[PDB]
A and B are shown apart, each in its own frame.
Chain A
Amino acid sequence: MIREERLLKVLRAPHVSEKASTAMEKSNTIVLKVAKDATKAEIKAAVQKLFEVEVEVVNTLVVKGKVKRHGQRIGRRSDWKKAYVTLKEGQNLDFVGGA
């Protein structure tokens, strides 16, 4: 494929947030703590080879940490990158381990 890129680890970690399970109509989607820079296309393909599910579309964004914490008074942000990404209907979680 044109797997030549970084399809290796563009995706990682779920989210099990409040949005989880609440965000399931015609198509369960997802979250994934996707790497800060995985783009949409790469994400679409990430779930292709792995998870073996059919992705319709991707979205993603950023969300930023922020907090003071220090030996006295400094502390800083953290940064992330959410990613909904939709799948389909005719294919459920199937043989897998939810969590």
Chain B
Amino acid sequence: MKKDIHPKYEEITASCSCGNVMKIRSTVGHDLNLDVCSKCHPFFTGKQRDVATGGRVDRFNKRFNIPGSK
């Protein structure tokens, strides 16, 4: 639902089988929290994968300079 840093997902899709299922699929990603900011100290964001790995090449700061600004 979140993965805040990055968008998210929760888009639907149909999970076909052998030929076809007109069913539906959805909810993905995950969560976690408690991220230590070099500054004061951690607010627990509920990012997920692709969100967690993002806080790496990036920052922790710029990775937050948005969930604030905008």
Q: Per the CB under 8 Å rule, do A and B touch in the complex?
A: no
Contacts from A to B (Cβ < 8 Å): none
